[PDB]
């Protein structure tokens, strides 16, 4: 099976450089939107992430084209996915809106140019200061996640004499037990009284209901079933309360392919295979909404799908070693070829914490057979800081000729990879480079400096 | 039985405030070294960590007393555990040395006042710039982790005309994990002789001894005994073969800390939140093996977790609450779940999520009240997985039924691997840090990240 696994992985490698809209090859090197990534990693210090504005645009087009059957669709990028200002700017320039998950995310979205009417603010803990900031900035939506929080929305909107526009988050029990496993939202049974309360509030304007199914969802059925619950309650409440809702917000969760050989993958057992497309998500949602109204606005909150495929992590092979296991008589049992790169799980956190797979290739030797089994380690002083989600078990494939100094690329590294970095071991969080629409590159986030990292501390100087 | 679990947890609670060397009660509140933690969390915004210099001192005393049978012991705090400058200063002033795990860790140790001869620099990826910085600063030890890295140490020490003092890291294959497959660090035992012979010939590299590090939160003494014996046996053999006398042996870290205290109810080999050994057991195993070789040689140890783990509390305010109910198909209640939301989630206390780490949780504002209600404890991140899964019983915690929004929740034993592992996910800031000094007074030693801090790393058009 290993030889066939090796054959299959090299077929995937060839597809990257001859059949992928993002990539080419030049001088033996992987190129991204025409940019030679080996050369790029000689210009900027590794490790760093490189984002593609062209690919973000293609992803947004996929999402928007998926919703062509429903004209009144509004798309809010879930900025917890990635909020580097230059990424947010590319997303704003590509024509969609923004969902924010904290006061500082709201502020960043406003500062990069999203208008208040292009921002949704969601959360389970929206303290009075957070709500005051959001209400004062006339956000399109602030979700209502609990009755406790709603009391603060009422009080603060009254204090500011400013209308707060809200959607009530309802998390349906769609059979694993919503009460035990879903911290967010209200129960369906609480929706009516919550909406009745809001109608009576002078400065709180009820716009619709909200749900969010989850992340990297491998089937369309959960979106259909959950949307139907919220549509049925929306229809019922319009009748009971004598109102017409502005909108329904169905959240995010469109998956991204992290493994591409779907013929060999089962998305229900390995959700690195994308089980559905944006079109499947849209078909499920739109079909359920149109059983109630065709004119109502549908709000969607895609995160991962906007940026996931649109970045690469570039990391230099910085050390190598061979480790050999010997039996008790001194005979070799096996050899392990370790390659150390300058990025570990403080840089690429989900590879460790969420068992996330990313394709790994030698970008400096992209046209060479990846014919050697290796283990790939990071630089942290932690026995667990190596990449466990290999091609076969914990083993990766690289050219046997791989050399210290080569650039390794992790593909599909654009979602949930920047804000989740740490300064563990006082290794810096990475710089970030952007490829713009013209194929030109610029730095959009600096690498943390020494002074950056000590300046939060308060201590007598030396 | 849940009643017995509740009774046991409340016995543990009473032992915190009437038995534990760290804690007391006043005005119904948990006190740490006499500091009322409810009051403290009204002076500083939550969430934040509070460290105890007294408890750091007690932990260091435990470690050093454990080594009483071997006078020439040098203790290096593994600063990857916590490198806030004021914490490092407390450890420096307690009289021990520092182990560093990156160039910037070396620099901050020097800056806070550790001399070069008090610093060990360890790593698997020590780039030429890292090595030049370390060698220029006359560090007590730079470990040798690979043959590749050793070539840089030789070349750079020659260029600087400064002696690099080294210990060769050897990771034994001790049957338990397979070292070649699961241990990225160190050289094989079989490589130690030639590596040492080559160092002896280098003009500006000085061989001091061998190094190993077993692991973290180790619940048995046998791993230390077996691994130390391998390194002692090879040390003795190399002294004979090469005609040298080693300065030292470095046996690393891994002394566990109790995260659950009711040892009568635990199996440390199945649940390593129970500490399976004490510092005395660690020292007994190490010293016994070293003294079969030499009683005069220096033993270097690298404790991390044990120095600071018990010495901090995370204080976080209950900031929201809700009740979720599962209803049967007749609308009758199947069960209720009481959710309490605190202002810290796994971006603040990462190991609670990523390493399934248990920390005792109490209501510091109601510390003398029976913790008599089962609750689920959630953080503030917009992520369904951001709740604390490592409960008292399954995913459930115990708090007083009188718990109210505004109460302060404490997580105990929050001093190891809790600061540098924080993130800005959702653009929630990394926390402030307070220190209780040995006189019982408090000061801020790290600010909470500001909004400026969220964006100043980014390069964007205004
Ligand atoms: Cl839009
Ligand atoms: Cl010492
Ligand atoms: Na109203
Ligand atoms: Na020498």
PDB file of N, CA and C in Angstrom, chain B residues 311-401:
ATOM      1  N   UNK B 311       1.885  28.046  41.462  1.00  0.00           N
ATOM      2  CA  UNK B 311       2.127  29.386  41.960  1.00  0.00           C
ATOM      3  C   UNK B 311       1.302  30.460  41.263  1.00  0.00           C
ATOM      4  N   UNK B 312       0.291  30.102  40.466  1.00  0.00           N
ATOM      5  CA  UNK B 312      -0.578  31.123  39.907  1.00  0.00           C
ATOM      6  C   UNK B 312      -2.016  30.650  39.943  1.00  0.00           C
ATOM      7  N   UNK B 313      -2.922  31.627  39.926  1.00  0.00           N
ATOM      8  CA  UNK B 313      -4.351  31.404  39.766  1.00  0.00           C
ATOM      9  C   UNK B 313      -4.827  32.236  38.586  1.00  0.00           C
ATOM     10  N   UNK B 314      -5.723  31.679  37.786  1.00  0.00           N
ATOM     11  CA  UNK B 314      -6.417  32.440  36.760  1.00  0.00           C
ATOM     12  C   UNK B 314      -7.706  32.936  37.368  1.00  0.00           C
ATOM     13  N   UNK B 315      -7.907  34.255  37.350  1.00  0.00           N
ATOM     14  CA  UNK B 315      -9.129  34.883  37.837  1.00  0.00           C
ATOM     15  C   UNK B 315      -9.947  35.348  36.638  1.00  0.00           C
ATOM     16  N   UNK B 316     -11.209  34.934  36.596  1.00  0.00           N
ATOM     17  CA  UNK B 316     -12.068  35.209  35.454  1.00  0.00           C
ATOM     18  C   UNK B 316     -13.472  35.463  35.966  1.00  0.00           C
ATOM     19  N   UNK B 317     -14.120  36.501  35.453  1.00  0.00           N
ATOM     20  CA  UNK B 317     -15.427  36.900  35.953  1.00  0.00           C
ATOM     21  C   UNK B 317     -16.529  36.143  35.231  1.00  0.00           C
ATOM     22  N   UNK B 318     -17.518  35.677  35.999  1.00  0.00           N
ATOM     23  CA  UNK B 318     -18.733  35.156  35.401  1.00  0.00           C
ATOM     24  C   UNK B 318     -19.411  36.328  34.721  1.00  0.00           C
ATOM     25  N   UNK B 319     -19.546  36.238  33.418  1.00  0.00           N
ATOM     26  CA  UNK B 319     -19.956  37.365  32.595  1.00  0.00           C
ATOM     27  C   UNK B 319     -21.279  37.154  31.892  1.00  0.00           C
ATOM     28  N   UNK B 320     -21.811  35.939  31.912  1.00  0.00           N
ATOM     29  CA  UNK B 320     -23.130  35.640  31.379  1.00  0.00           C
ATOM     30  C   UNK B 320     -23.557  34.292  31.932  1.00  0.00           C
ATOM     31  N   UNK B 321     -24.837  33.986  31.763  1.00  0.00           N
ATOM     32  CA  UNK B 321     -25.388  32.707  32.188  1.00  0.00           C
ATOM     33  C   UNK B 321     -26.593  32.404  31.317  1.00  0.00           C
ATOM     34  N   UNK B 322     -26.926  31.119  31.203  1.00  0.00           N
ATOM     35  CA  UNK B 322     -28.157  30.710  30.539  1.00  0.00           C
ATOM     36  C   UNK B 322     -28.490  29.300  30.995  1.00  0.00           C
ATOM     37  N   UNK B 323     -29.745  28.938  30.832  1.00  0.00           N
ATOM     38  CA  UNK B 323     -30.234  27.588  31.050  1.00  0.00           C
ATOM     39  C   UNK B 323     -30.660  27.032  29.704  1.00  0.00           C
ATOM     40  N   UNK B 324     -30.167  25.850  29.355  1.00  0.00           N
ATOM     41  CA  UNK B 324     -30.657  25.143  28.185  1.00  0.00           C
ATOM     42  C   UNK B 324     -31.380  23.890  28.640  1.00  0.00           C
ATOM     43  N   UNK B 325     -32.426  23.537  27.920  1.00  0.00           N
ATOM     44  CA  UNK B 325     -33.284  22.441  28.327  1.00  0.00           C
ATOM     45  C   UNK B 325     -33.459  21.515  27.142  1.00  0.00           C
ATOM     46  N   UNK B 326     -33.296  20.220  27.380  1.00  0.00           N
ATOM     47  CA  UNK B 326     -33.707  19.208  26.419  1.00  0.00           C
ATOM     48  C   UNK B 326     -35.137  18.806  26.753  1.00  0.00           C
ATOM     49  N   UNK B 327     -36.033  18.929  25.780  1.00  0.00           N
ATOM     50  CA  UNK B 327     -37.432  18.566  25.943  1.00  0.00           C
ATOM     51  C   UNK B 327     -37.711  17.282  25.178  1.00  0.00           C
ATOM     52  N   UNK B 328     -38.586  16.440  25.726  1.00  0.00           N
ATOM     53  CA  UNK B 328     -39.011  15.259  24.989  1.00  0.00           C
ATOM     54  C   UNK B 328     -40.074  15.652  23.970  1.00  0.00           C
ATOM     55  N   UNK B 329     -40.532  14.674  23.193  1.00  0.00           N
ATOM     56  CA  UNK B 329     -41.471  14.980  22.121  1.00  0.00           C
ATOM     57  C   UNK B 329     -42.833  15.441  22.632  1.00  0.00           C
ATOM     58  N   UNK B 330     -43.133  15.257  23.918  1.00  0.00           N
ATOM     59  CA  UNK B 330     -44.344  15.800  24.524  1.00  0.00           C
ATOM     60  C   UNK B 330     -44.121  17.166  25.175  1.00  0.00           C
ATOM     61  N   UNK B 331     -42.968  17.790  24.962  1.00  0.00           N
ATOM     62  CA  UNK B 331     -42.687  19.071  25.582  1.00  0.00           C
ATOM     63  C   UNK B 331     -42.341  19.011  27.053  1.00  0.00           C
ATOM     64  N   UNK B 332     -42.222  17.818  27.627  1.00  0.00           N
ATOM     65  CA  UNK B 332     -41.795  17.689  29.010  1.00  0.00           C
ATOM     66  C   UNK B 332     -40.279  17.765  29.092  1.00  0.00           C
ATOM     67  N   UNK B 333     -39.790  18.265  30.226  1.00  0.00           N
ATOM     68  CA  UNK B 333     -38.359  18.440  30.409  1.00  0.00           C
ATOM     69  C   UNK B 333     -37.692  17.082  30.587  1.00  0.00           C
ATOM     70  N   UNK B 334     -36.639  16.835  29.806  1.00  0.00           N
ATOM     71  CA  UNK B 334     -35.748  15.705  30.045  1.00  0.00           C
ATOM     72  C   UNK B 334     -34.622  16.073  31.001  1.00  0.00           C
ATOM     73  N   UNK B 335     -33.995  17.227  30.794  1.00  0.00           N
ATOM     74  CA  UNK B 335     -33.003  17.715  31.738  1.00  0.00           C
ATOM     75  C   UNK B 335     -32.729  19.182  31.446  1.00  0.00           C
ATOM     76  N   UNK B 336     -32.194  19.864  32.453  1.00  0.00           N
ATOM     77  CA  UNK B 336     -31.703  21.222  32.337  1.00  0.00           C
ATOM     78  C   UNK B 336     -30.186  21.230  32.436  1.00  0.00           C
ATOM     79  N   UNK B 337     -29.558  22.144  31.698  1.00  0.00           N
ATOM     80  CA  UNK B 337     -28.129  22.416  31.789  1.00  0.00           C
ATOM     81  C   UNK B 337     -27.955  23.889  32.129  1.00  0.00           C
ATOM     82  N   UNK B 338     -27.266  24.162  33.220  1.00  0.00           N
ATOM     83  CA  UNK B 338     -26.952  25.518  33.652  1.00  0.00           C
ATOM     84  C   UNK B 338     -25.568  25.883  33.140  1.00  0.00           C
ATOM     85  N   UNK B 339     -25.523  26.785  32.172  1.00  0.00           N
ATOM     86  CA  UNK B 339     -24.290  27.286  31.598  1.00  0.00           C
ATOM     87  C   UNK B 339     -23.863  28.578  32.272  1.00  0.00           C
ATOM     88  N   UNK B 340     -22.629  28.621  32.737  1.00  0.00           N
ATOM     89  CA  UNK B 340     -22.022  29.838  33.248  1.00  0.00           C
ATOM     90  C   UNK B 340     -20.897  30.205  32.307  1.00  0.00           C
ATOM     91  N   UNK B 341     -20.867  31.446  31.850  1.00  0.00           N
ATOM     92  CA  UNK B 341     -19.855  31.917  30.928  1.00  0.00           C
ATOM     93  C   UNK B 341     -18.874  32.799  31.667  1.00  0.00           C
ATOM     94  N   UNK B 342     -17.607  32.470  31.547  1.00  0.00           N
ATOM     95  CA  UNK B 342     -16.549  33.303  32.091  1.00  0.00           C
ATOM     96  C   UNK B 342     -15.844  34.023  30.956  1.00  0.00           C
ATOM     97  N   UNK B 343     -15.098  35.062  31.320  1.00  0.00           N
ATOM     98  CA  UNK B 343     -14.428  35.911  30.351  1.00  0.00           C
ATOM     99  C   UNK B 343     -13.070  35.396  29.894  1.00  0.00           C
ATOM    100  N   UNK B 344     -12.705  34.190  30.301  1.00  0.00           N
ATOM    101  CA  UNK B 344     -11.531  33.467  29.817  1.00  0.00           C
ATOM    102  C   UNK B 344     -11.978  32.188  29.126  1.00  0.00           C
ATOM    103  N   UNK B 345     -11.456  31.945  27.923  1.00  0.00           N
ATOM    104  CA  UNK B 345     -11.643  30.671  27.259  1.00  0.00           C
ATOM    105  C   UNK B 345     -10.312  30.078  26.872  1.00  0.00           C
ATOM    106  N   UNK B 346     -10.290  29.216  25.872  1.00  0.00           N
ATOM    107  CA  UNK B 346      -9.035  28.512  25.641  1.00  0.00           C
ATOM    108  C   UNK B 346      -7.964  29.361  24.966  1.00  0.00           C
ATOM    109  N   UNK B 347      -8.278  30.564  24.496  1.00  0.00           N
ATOM    110  CA  UNK B 347      -7.239  31.486  24.067  1.00  0.00           C
ATOM    111  C   UNK B 347      -6.440  32.032  25.244  1.00  0.00           C
ATOM    112  N   UNK B 348      -7.012  31.945  26.443  1.00  0.00           N
ATOM    113  CA  UNK B 348      -6.399  32.398  27.685  1.00  0.00           C
ATOM    114  C   UNK B 348      -5.759  31.249  28.451  1.00  0.00           C
ATOM    115  N   UNK B 349      -6.435  30.100  28.528  1.00  0.00           N
ATOM    116  CA  UNK B 349      -5.999  28.899  29.258  1.00  0.00           C
ATOM    117  C   UNK B 349      -5.971  27.765  28.237  1.00  0.00           C
ATOM    118  N   UNK B 350      -4.896  27.726  27.468  1.00  0.00           N
ATOM    119  CA  UNK B 350      -4.925  26.884  26.283  1.00  0.00           C
ATOM    120  C   UNK B 350      -4.916  25.398  26.621  1.00  0.00           C
ATOM    121  N   UNK B 351      -4.201  24.977  27.659  1.00  0.00           N
ATOM    122  CA  UNK B 351      -4.039  23.545  27.884  1.00  0.00           C
ATOM    123  C   UNK B 351      -5.329  22.877  28.328  1.00  0.00           C
ATOM    124  N   UNK B 352      -6.273  23.651  28.858  1.00  0.00           N
ATOM    125  CA  UNK B 352      -7.579  23.106  29.231  1.00  0.00           C
ATOM    126  C   UNK B 352      -8.295  22.512  28.035  1.00  0.00           C
ATOM    127  N   UNK B 353      -8.002  23.007  26.840  1.00  0.00           N
ATOM    128  CA  UNK B 353      -8.577  22.526  25.596  1.00  0.00           C
ATOM    129  C   UNK B 353      -7.628  21.599  24.867  1.00  0.00           C
ATOM    130  N   UNK B 354      -6.404  22.045  24.646  1.00  0.00           N
ATOM    131  CA  UNK B 354      -5.545  21.364  23.693  1.00  0.00           C
ATOM    132  C   UNK B 354      -4.843  20.159  24.278  1.00  0.00           C
ATOM    133  N   UNK B 355      -4.711  20.095  25.606  1.00  0.00           N
ATOM    134  CA  UNK B 355      -4.030  18.985  26.254  1.00  0.00           C
ATOM    135  C   UNK B 355      -4.874  18.370  27.355  1.00  0.00           C
ATOM    136  N   UNK B 356      -6.176  18.618  27.319  1.00  0.00           N
ATOM    137  CA  UNK B 356      -7.121  17.987  28.232  1.00  0.00           C
ATOM    138  C   UNK B 356      -6.640  18.113  29.674  1.00  0.00           C
ATOM    139  N   UNK B 357      -6.211  19.310  30.025  1.00  0.00           N
ATOM    140  CA  UNK B 357      -5.586  19.534  31.317  1.00  0.00           C
ATOM    141  C   UNK B 357      -6.643  19.948  32.323  1.00  0.00           C
ATOM    142  N   UNK B 358      -6.586  19.338  33.505  1.00  0.00           N
ATOM    143  CA  UNK B 358      -7.493  19.657  34.606  1.00  0.00           C
ATOM    144  C   UNK B 358      -6.875  20.708  35.516  1.00  0.00           C
ATOM    145  N   UNK B 359      -7.699  21.677  35.923  1.00  0.00           N
ATOM    146  CA  UNK B 359      -7.368  22.646  36.949  1.00  0.00           C
ATOM    147  C   UNK B 359      -8.573  22.718  37.876  1.00  0.00           C
ATOM    148  N   UNK B 360      -8.319  22.764  39.178  1.00  0.00           N
ATOM    149  CA  UNK B 360      -9.427  22.978  40.109  1.00  0.00           C
ATOM    150  C   UNK B 360     -10.092  24.308  39.824  1.00  0.00           C
ATOM    151  N   UNK B 361     -11.427  24.294  39.856  1.00  0.00           N
ATOM    152  CA  UNK B 361     -12.265  25.465  39.625  1.00  0.00           C
ATOM    153  C   UNK B 361     -13.133  25.707  40.855  1.00  0.00           C
ATOM    154  N   UNK B 362     -13.084  26.927  41.362  1.00  0.00           N
ATOM    155  CA  UNK B 362     -13.901  27.337  42.494  1.00  0.00           C
ATOM    156  C   UNK B 362     -14.441  28.735  42.265  1.00  0.00           C
ATOM    157  N   UNK B 363     -15.511  29.051  42.984  1.00  0.00           N
ATOM    158  CA  UNK B 363     -16.039  30.406  43.002  1.00  0.00           C
ATOM    159  C   UNK B 363     -15.293  31.166  44.084  1.00  0.00           C
ATOM    160  N   UNK B 364     -14.303  31.961  43.674  1.00  0.00           N
ATOM    161  CA  UNK B 364     -13.501  32.713  44.624  1.00  0.00           C
ATOM    162  C   UNK B 364     -14.313  33.749  45.388  1.00  0.00           C
ATOM    163  N   UNK B 365     -15.398  34.243  44.811  1.00  0.00           N
ATOM    164  CA  UNK B 365     -16.258  35.198  45.510  1.00  0.00           C
ATOM    165  C   UNK B 365     -17.147  34.543  46.554  1.00  0.00           C
ATOM    166  N   UNK B 366     -17.317  33.230  46.470  1.00  0.00           N
ATOM    167  CA  UNK B 366     -18.186  32.448  47.342  1.00  0.00           C
ATOM    168  C   UNK B 366     -17.456  31.205  47.797  1.00  0.00           C
ATOM    169  N   UNK B 367     -16.196  31.387  48.202  1.00  0.00           N
ATOM    170  CA  UNK B 367     -15.324  30.246  48.428  1.00  0.00           C
ATOM    171  C   UNK B 367     -15.697  29.455  49.665  1.00  0.00           C
ATOM    172  N   UNK B 368     -16.353  30.083  50.632  1.00  0.00           N
ATOM    173  CA  UNK B 368     -16.799  29.392  51.830  1.00  0.00           C
ATOM    174  C   UNK B 368     -18.187  28.778  51.680  1.00  0.00           C
ATOM    175  N   UNK B 369     -18.826  28.920  50.517  1.00  0.00           N
ATOM    176  CA  UNK B 369     -20.153  28.368  50.291  1.00  0.00           C
ATOM    177  C   UNK B 369     -20.022  26.989  49.668  1.00  0.00           C
ATOM    178  N   UNK B 370     -20.938  26.104  50.027  1.00  0.00           N
ATOM    179  CA  UNK B 370     -20.979  24.784  49.412  1.00  0.00           C
ATOM    180  C   UNK B 370     -21.082  24.927  47.902  1.00  0.00           C
ATOM    181  N   UNK B 371     -20.229  24.204  47.192  1.00  0.00           N
ATOM    182  CA  UNK B 371     -20.289  24.158  45.733  1.00  0.00           C
ATOM    183  C   UNK B 371     -21.202  22.982  45.419  1.00  0.00           C
ATOM    184  N   UNK B 372     -22.497  23.296  45.306  1.00  0.00           N
ATOM    185  CA  UNK B 372     -23.576  22.317  45.379  1.00  0.00           C
ATOM    186  C   UNK B 372     -24.429  22.247  44.123  1.00  0.00           C
ATOM    187  N   UNK B 373     -24.031  22.908  43.048  1.00  0.00           N
ATOM    188  CA  UNK B 373     -24.809  22.921  41.816  1.00  0.00           C
ATOM    189  C   UNK B 373     -23.912  22.494  40.664  1.00  0.00           C
ATOM    190  N   UNK B 374     -24.403  21.557  39.858  1.00  0.00           N
ATOM    191  CA  UNK B 374     -23.709  21.123  38.656  1.00  0.00           C
ATOM    192  C   UNK B 374     -23.934  22.139  37.550  1.00  0.00           C
ATOM    193  N   UNK B 375     -22.841  22.588  36.926  1.00  0.00           N
ATOM    194  CA  UNK B 375     -22.891  23.608  35.894  1.00  0.00           C
ATOM    195  C   UNK B 375     -21.921  23.207  34.802  1.00  0.00           C
ATOM    196  N   UNK B 376     -22.149  23.747  33.620  1.00  0.00           N
ATOM    197  CA  UNK B 376     -21.157  23.687  32.566  1.00  0.00           C
ATOM    198  C   UNK B 376     -20.542  25.065  32.417  1.00  0.00           C
ATOM    199  N   UNK B 377     -19.240  25.088  32.212  1.00  0.00           N
ATOM    200  CA  UNK B 377     -18.459  26.314  32.264  1.00  0.00           C
ATOM    201  C   UNK B 377     -17.938  26.615  30.867  1.00  0.00           C
ATOM    202  N   UNK B 378     -18.346  27.750  30.315  1.00  0.00           N
ATOM    203  CA  UNK B 378     -18.024  28.128  28.954  1.00  0.00           C
ATOM    204  C   UNK B 378     -17.147  29.367  28.932  1.00  0.00           C
ATOM    205  N   UNK B 379     -16.323  29.462  27.895  1.00  0.00           N
ATOM    206  CA  UNK B 379     -15.591  30.665  27.633  1.00  0.00           C
ATOM    207  C   UNK B 379     -16.322  31.603  26.676  1.00  0.00           C
ATOM    208  N   UNK B 380     -15.658  32.707  26.319  1.00  0.00           N
ATOM    209  CA  UNK B 380     -16.282  33.755  25.496  1.00  0.00           C
ATOM    210  C   UNK B 380     -15.999  33.675  23.999  1.00  0.00           C
ATOM    211  N   UNK B 381     -15.233  32.697  23.539  1.00  0.00           N
ATOM    212  CA  UNK B 381     -14.911  32.649  22.125  1.00  0.00           C
ATOM    213  C   UNK B 381     -16.124  32.202  21.331  1.00  0.00           C
ATOM    214  N   UNK B 382     -16.231  32.729  20.117  1.00  0.00           N
ATOM    215  CA  UNK B 382     -17.259  32.315  19.168  1.00  0.00           C
ATOM    216  C   UNK B 382     -16.828  31.015  18.509  1.00  0.00           C
ATOM    217  N   UNK B 383     -16.950  29.943  19.278  1.00  0.00           N
ATOM    218  CA  UNK B 383     -16.448  28.623  18.911  1.00  0.00           C
ATOM    219  C   UNK B 383     -17.191  27.650  19.803  1.00  0.00           C
ATOM    220  N   UNK B 384     -17.978  26.756  19.207  1.00  0.00           N
ATOM    221  CA  UNK B 384     -18.719  25.812  20.020  1.00  0.00           C
ATOM    222  C   UNK B 384     -17.849  24.943  20.901  1.00  0.00           C
ATOM    223  N   UNK B 385     -16.585  24.763  20.539  1.00  0.00           N
ATOM    224  CA  UNK B 385     -15.708  23.992  21.382  1.00  0.00           C
ATOM    225  C   UNK B 385     -15.108  24.746  22.547  1.00  0.00           C
ATOM    226  N   UNK B 386     -15.299  26.070  22.618  1.00  0.00           N
ATOM    227  CA  UNK B 386     -14.738  26.861  23.713  1.00  0.00           C
ATOM    228  C   UNK B 386     -15.630  26.786  24.948  1.00  0.00           C
ATOM    229  N   UNK B 387     -15.583  25.619  25.574  1.00  0.00           N
ATOM    230  CA  UNK B 387     -16.030  25.443  26.943  1.00  0.00           C
ATOM    231  C   UNK B 387     -15.081  24.459  27.594  1.00  0.00           C
ATOM    232  N   UNK B 388     -15.072  24.464  28.910  1.00  0.00           N
ATOM    233  CA  UNK B 388     -14.116  23.669  29.671  1.00  0.00           C
ATOM    234  C   UNK B 388     -14.640  22.254  29.796  1.00  0.00           C
ATOM    235  N   UNK B 389     -13.975  21.322  29.138  1.00  0.00           N
ATOM    236  CA  UNK B 389     -14.431  19.943  29.127  1.00  0.00           C
ATOM    237  C   UNK B 389     -13.921  19.115  30.296  1.00  0.00           C
ATOM    238  N   UNK B 390     -12.878  19.560  30.984  1.00  0.00           N
ATOM    239  CA  UNK B 390     -12.236  18.743  32.019  1.00  0.00           C
ATOM    240  C   UNK B 390     -12.860  19.092  33.360  1.00  0.00           C
ATOM    241  N   UNK B 391     -14.068  18.586  33.545  1.00  0.00           N
ATOM    242  CA  UNK B 391     -14.859  18.895  34.717  1.00  0.00           C
ATOM    243  C   UNK B 391     -14.543  18.046  35.938  1.00  0.00           C
ATOM    244  N   UNK B 392     -15.329  18.306  36.983  1.00  0.00           N
ATOM    245  CA  UNK B 392     -15.307  17.496  38.202  1.00  0.00           C
ATOM    246  C   UNK B 392     -15.907  16.114  37.948  1.00  0.00           C
ATOM    247  N   UNK B 393     -16.969  16.050  37.148  1.00  0.00           N
ATOM    248  CA  UNK B 393     -17.647  14.807  36.777  1.00  0.00           C
ATOM    249  C   UNK B 393     -17.938  14.954  35.291  1.00  0.00           C
ATOM    250  N   UNK B 394     -17.191  14.251  34.462  1.00  0.00           N
ATOM    251  CA  UNK B 394     -17.370  14.455  33.035  1.00  0.00           C
ATOM    252  C   UNK B 394     -17.067  15.898  32.708  1.00  0.00           C
ATOM    253  N   UNK B 395     -17.965  16.517  31.954  1.00  0.00           N
ATOM    254  CA  UNK B 395     -17.821  17.903  31.544  1.00  0.00           C
ATOM    255  C   UNK B 395     -18.531  18.854  32.487  1.00  0.00           C
ATOM    256  N   UNK B 396     -18.947  18.388  33.652  1.00  0.00           N
ATOM    257  CA  UNK B 396     -19.677  19.230  34.591  1.00  0.00           C
ATOM    258  C   UNK B 396     -18.783  19.661  35.747  1.00  0.00           C
ATOM    259  N   UNK B 397     -18.949  20.909  36.164  1.00  0.00           N
ATOM    260  CA  UNK B 397     -18.280  21.501  37.305  1.00  0.00           C
ATOM    261  C   UNK B 397     -19.274  21.695  38.436  1.00  0.00           C
ATOM    262  N   UNK B 398     -18.744  22.061  39.603  1.00  0.00           N
ATOM    263  CA  UNK B 398     -19.548  22.378  40.790  1.00  0.00           C
ATOM    264  C   UNK B 398     -19.299  23.817  41.222  1.00  0.00           C
ATOM    265  N   UNK B 399     -20.368  24.587  41.340  1.00  0.00           N
ATOM    266  CA  UNK B 399     -20.271  25.928  41.885  1.00  0.00           C
ATOM    267  C   UNK B 399     -21.439  26.103  42.838  1.00  0.00           C
ATOM    268  N   UNK B 400     -21.385  27.089  43.723  1.00  0.00           N
ATOM    269  CA  UNK B 400     -22.551  27.360  44.569  1.00  0.00           C
ATOM    270  C   UNK B 400     -23.782  27.652  43.722  1.00  0.00           C
ATOM    271  N   UNK B 401     -24.935  27.163  44.164  1.00  0.00           N
ATOM    272  CA  UNK B 401     -26.169  27.493  43.464  1.00  0.00           C
ATOM    273  C   UNK B 401     -26.446  28.990  43.503  1.00  0.00           C
TER     274      UNK B 401
END
